[PDB]
Design a binder for this molecule. Sequence first.
Ligand SMILES: O=C(c1ncnc2[nH]ccc12)N1CCCC12CCCCC2
Length: 167
Amino acid sequence: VNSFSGYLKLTDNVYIKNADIVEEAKKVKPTVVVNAANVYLKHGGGVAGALNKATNNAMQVESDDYIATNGPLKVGGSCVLSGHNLAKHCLHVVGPNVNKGEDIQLLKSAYENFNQHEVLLAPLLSAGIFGADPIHSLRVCVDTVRTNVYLAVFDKNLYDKLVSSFL
Ligand SMILES: O=C(c1ncnc2[nH]ccc12)N1CCCC12CCCCC2
């Protein structure tokens, strides 16, 4: 039993809710919140900008030190950093950005990072400003992640379309 509330169950291990991941993170305090990161950990907009703003820019300060030490992430890769006031940890995962021409096949590699964590609160990778089809992202998620994932979908219209078209 866990503290996630109001989710629709899609499969054995994947759950979905129309929610603001920032508000869900602050209420739930999950062990892991996933950020929709880029390779430079520049949290300017979309989910990353929202999560970073909610940390009063502490996420960005920590991220800049991470990059200065380690260099950029790989597309499809991840790193674990602090969750600040939102979660125990933040898993920064880089899905491919279609608006940069990155290979959508790397979306599966991106979701594989979730399997290193027993339970996660997450957005749909490569959705939103990353330019992928969210229906496809949900399919890749369901077919790749084996751990327990609670997906927060900000847009109600998109949430209803994801549920109603789910196979
Ligand atoms: O739904 C979300 C989303 N999901 C969870 N937490 C969130 N926080 C802030 C936004 C947000 N996003 C993020 C990028 C674009 C998109 C997907 C595509 C349709 C517009 C909205």
